[PDB]
Design a protein around this ligand. Structure first.
Ligand SMILES: */C=C/C1=C(C)C(=O)N/C1=C\c1[nH]c(Cc2[nH]c(/C=C3\NC(=O)C(C=C)=C3C)c(C)c2CCC(=O)O)c(CCC(=O)O)c1C
Ligand SMILES: */C=C/C1=C(C)C(=O)N/C1=C\c1[nH]c(Cc2[nH]c(/C=C3\NC(=O)C(C=C)=C3C)c(C)c2CCC(=O)O)c(CCC(=O)O)c1C
Lengths: 505, 505
């Protein structure tokens, strides 16, 4: 299987067929630039019913002097750079001014107008210091905490959001507010863990594609998108600025007491690393696209810089383990029975991967070594490995997640790292580890992270986001990066001296 | 001792006591205030002569509303996130505006003032957009050829230089132009190679620490950094931006017919990996600090991607290899004599590293697969001890370097990929490659450059930079690092079946 979706992961956030009403979404034909769809809030904002617009060339509605550069651009395929377009819409004799945001996706050409007349507006002065200084600050960050610390201060500053945090995912996609800047109005979340389920899978993948979103108000009545016939196929809105969002997330922000929000994907290695996340606790926030893409730009600068600073590292040990490996290989090098010459090095063996126990099943015939008793349970643990995969270095910090019968044992208070000495898969090498107790602070009860309706099958978000002390058990400490290099390394040398043994008949 | 300094690794280019004069170098006491050094070209740039300037405190000549934030700024511990400084100079009744570039080095505070051109909204918005878009273009580079191409186009875009190239060092600290964007009317340096003696060691070392230098004109007059008595210790000007470059280099640049110069260090692994080099072939090039460090920032991001994008090189042959190797992994199952399992798909085994000969020496008996040396291949097969495998893959394109008897057969094997199968080192796979004649475009006879004055004991650069072919004998076509990879992978996979086979009989 492997994944293994829950109820939340089954929603299609991408094709709601409705948008946020504060500005208009059109799709143009190519090469006609003819309005094929138009969202029904068109009069409200533009001056025309959808009726009037469906099936006209676009140049009909544009003030004749700015017709040329706009067409010339829309037809460019260098588009995402050209944004934001200047659009002037002329009803009767009156001119309205919008920012055009255009993109092509799944064969359509979408254009979204946001009013740039009646504005929030950002004094260029501090727009200038944010992207000019901001860049310099980030680049001068000494460690991972200073980078985070700078990016939330700069973004907040440029946007005047009440709260703006850094949320960092973990290996199961649980969250964690590892940096924060705010105005004493908002309750500090620095520290709180959130469940994986707050940002479900169909979201998280969308967000790896579209690195920026903004909800200026949770209170709107979505605008349906009209078409003219032939195109009742639900239009794909993955890259719409104005796409309407899942209403249980509107309800979630409502249970969180935030009135507008905005976030930005952080990427390390083209998988979602974290989020910059911004809340207005009270009052809508209509942030102009320029200031959006300025903030978006500052996440891309952090993203492109995480690998440097989060490489504050630990390259020692690594040199230590590289030197424990040198000794062990030497022992086996020299006994004619290396299994018995490996476990004769209980220290170097235990200390290669930082384990508190270890085991060697070889031609029979278990020999245990450190502090991990099992024995009558170790037999279950072994043959369990041989069955369906366990090749190469298995590795888990919660052996009840895979082998649910380890909860019965010491648990990952004997945590596993293992592999087979050969491909025939009959001789293994194990590794066990104590428990990491660790009381963890949640935002609300995790186990009631989803509440249900009447009477109804319908999912609502939780109500309390108050702190909630959980003590997590089975999980041990993580198997760090190098610790799993030195397993395959030791695997590769167990194979060499074994190969040289038999070459010696 | 490693390096090994010819005649140029002496001249202390870091204490010339003179500056490129288009700006003013200052040295301020601390706590704040009061100047002890002043470049003599003070009055050209700034009104006042360096004798009115010497001894007085800075804020005396600064417009008053500007004077507190500035001395609050020149104290801050970390001024690198501050540059450029808003310095407003009030000579007579007029204000003149300068970029201030601040830095502390060897207990001394330096302030160099370039002239500033006042930042306006519309042109900044385009500058921001271009750093923002050139940045993603680096991120999205598939391979190193792409990553480089991006860099020089973007740097050029932002700067208006005639040429930007990417200059890569080899093992001897020689050079080669490996990517190039340029206005076409100026001569094309792509492909060229330059002797290790245009950038002597103390210059490479200096650029290892300071990553950006700009010579906006090569014909200029070095304003001397004058001072106050008691403060005559030579001025450590390494982290200066005005620091007058060493004179022989300026002859290098006139003689190269280049009028303005800019360069940026790239780092891979803390060693100096290459540069991004920039040239104005007719005209000057004064590039404001902001635009300047925004290219250095692209230089950081470039270096931080060297290793990833390069591993993705040949991302079509890698597939092939993976596929041929898949093929050999299994034809070594149908036959219990896995050796002939390789020798059947010898058309394979040879295309796996694009070798035209091979040799398998297994249990004392050897078999030969392509054009190979005489059956006294018992040569290299015995020849090795230090390096030699140990394990794993050994690899050359000058076998008659390490193992001189190969001069005999260097027309059927002047290169050699070989590894040893067992820790015993009785078993080897060997791959051969013939001598390839190979022609190497230098930039005018590289045996020169090491040139003297009259000859008086002064140093002088070359004179003709014209395409000087070298013809490199005794070598084979270089081994692609994905070929060594394929050979490494193959070796470990032969070991797994040499184990599995013996173990199970
Ligand atoms: C059954 C599913 C859901 C439950 C239960 C729930 O509580 N939310 C569910 C679905 C859901 N969430 C989102 C989008 C989303 N979620 C978050 C979560 C957080 N915001 C924060 O500030 C913090 C902690 C500091 C967390 C953990 C965010 C940021 C987002 C992005 C939207 C935004 O920034 O406003 C979706 C997708 C909505 C969409 O249309 O894209 C869904 C279905
Ligand atoms: C006797 C020593 C020298 C000889 C001979 C010579 O030719 N130069 C010598 C000394 C020297 N050079 C530099 C600075 C420098 N040199 C280069 C070389 C190149 N620029 C190019 O475009 C290419 C190829 C196309 C080459 C090979 C560079 C790039 C630099 C860096 C400065 C810059 O780019 O403008 C120094 C140090 C000068 C200083 O004062 O900082 C010295 C001592």
């Amino acid at each position: 299987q492997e994944v293994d979706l829950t109820n939340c992961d089954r929603e299609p956030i991408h094709i709601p067929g409705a948008i946020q009403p504060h500005g208009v979404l059109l799709v143009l034909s190519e090469p006609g630039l003819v309005l094929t769809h138009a969202s029904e809030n068109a009069p409200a904002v533009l001056g025309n019913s959808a009726e009037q617009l469906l099936g006209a060339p676009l140049g009909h509605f544009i003030e004749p002097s700015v017709r040329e550069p706009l067409e010339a651009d829309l037809r460019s395929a260098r588009l995402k750079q050209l944004n934001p377009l200047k659009v002037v819409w002329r009803v009767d004799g009156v001119d309205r001014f919008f920012d055009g945001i255009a993109h092509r996706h799944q064969g359509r050409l979408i254009l979204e107008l946001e009013p740039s007349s009646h504005r929030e507006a950002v004094p260029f002065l501090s727009f200038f210091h944010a992207v000019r200084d901001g860049l310099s600050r980030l680049r001068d960050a000494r460690d991972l905490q200073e980078l985070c610390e700078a990016v939330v201060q700069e973004v907040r500053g440029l946007t005047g959001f009440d709260r703006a945090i850094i949320y960092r995912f973990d290996a199961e996609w649980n969250g964690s507010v590892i940096a924060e800047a705010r105005d004493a109005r908002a309750d500090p979340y620095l520290g709180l863990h959130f469940p994986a389920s707050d940002i479900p899978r169909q979201a998280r993948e969308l967000y790896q594609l579209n690195w920026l979103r903004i909800i200026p108000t949770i209170d709107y009545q979505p605008a349906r998108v009209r078409a003219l016939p032939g195109h009742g196929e639900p239009l794909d809105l993955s890259f719409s600025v104005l796409r309407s969002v899942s209403p249980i997330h509107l309800e979630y922000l409502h249970n969180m007491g935030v009135q507008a929000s905005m976030s930005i994907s952080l990427m390390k290695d083209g998988k979602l690393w974290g989020l910059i996340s911004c809340h207005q606790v009270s009052g809508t926030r209509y942030v102009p696209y320029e200031v959006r893409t300025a903030c978006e730009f500052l996440g891309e600068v952090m993203s492109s810089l995480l690998a440097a600073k989060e490489g504050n590292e630990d390259y020692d040990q690594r040199i230590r383990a590289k030197s424990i490996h040198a000794a062990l290989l030497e022992r086996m090098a020299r006994e004619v029975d290396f299994v018995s010459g490996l476990a004769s090095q209980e220290s170097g063996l235990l200390e290669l991967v930082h384990a508190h126990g270890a085991a060697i099943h070889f031609h029979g015939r278990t020999t245990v070594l450190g502090q991990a008793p099992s024995d009558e349970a170790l037999t279950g643990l072994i043959e369990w490995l041989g069955s369906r995969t366990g090749e190469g270095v298995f590795c888990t910090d919660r052996l009840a997640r895979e082998y649910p019968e380890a909860q019965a044992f010491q648990e990952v208070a004997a945590g596993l790292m293992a592999f087979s000495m050969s491909r025939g898969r009959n001789n293994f090498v194990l590794w066990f580890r104590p428990e990491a107790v660790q009381t963890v602070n949640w935002s609300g009860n995790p186990t009631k992270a989803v509440e249900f309706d009447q009477g109804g099958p319908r999912l609502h978000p939780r109500k309390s986001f108050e702190l909630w002390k959980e003590t997590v058990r089975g999980r041990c400490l993580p198997w760090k990066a190098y610790e799993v290099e030195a397993a395959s390394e030791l695997r590769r040398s167990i194979i060499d001296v074994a190969l040289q043994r038999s070459e010696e008949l």
